[PDB]
Amino acid sequence: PWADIMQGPSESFVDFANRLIKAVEGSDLPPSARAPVIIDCFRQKSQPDIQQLIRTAPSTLTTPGEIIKYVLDRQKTA
């Protein structure tokens, strides 16, 4: 179930994005509703450090690929 996917405390972001995109594209949603759902799940899941990282984006991110690129650039190396 896509709506139950959370980014674990120790999980990296690319694994979380892979799992989420997999569960959203392999589901019962229409094809035209996958990108907005993936974006809004990146924003509300993806534990509050990345949540604030996406929130304070000086540019407007309108695509899952752009969000992934931005987060991978500005992520907290740890």
Interface with its own copies by CB under 8 A: which residues?
1-4, 14, 17-22, 25, 28-30, 32-33, 36-38, 40-41, 43-45, 51-53, 55-60, 63-66, 68-70, 72-78
Q: Which is nearer to its own copies, 5 or 10 (CB)?
A: 5
Distance separating alpha carbons of residues 78 and 27, to the nearest angstrom: 33
Q: Which residues, in sequence order, are CB contacts of 25 under 8 Å at separation 6+?
A: 34
Tokens 């035209």 correspond to what residue? 32
For the CB of residue 51, give the shortest distance to its own copies in the complex, in Å.
7
Shortest spacing between CB 9 and its own copies, in angstroms: 17
CA angle (8 as vertex; 52, 33 as ends), nearest 5: 70
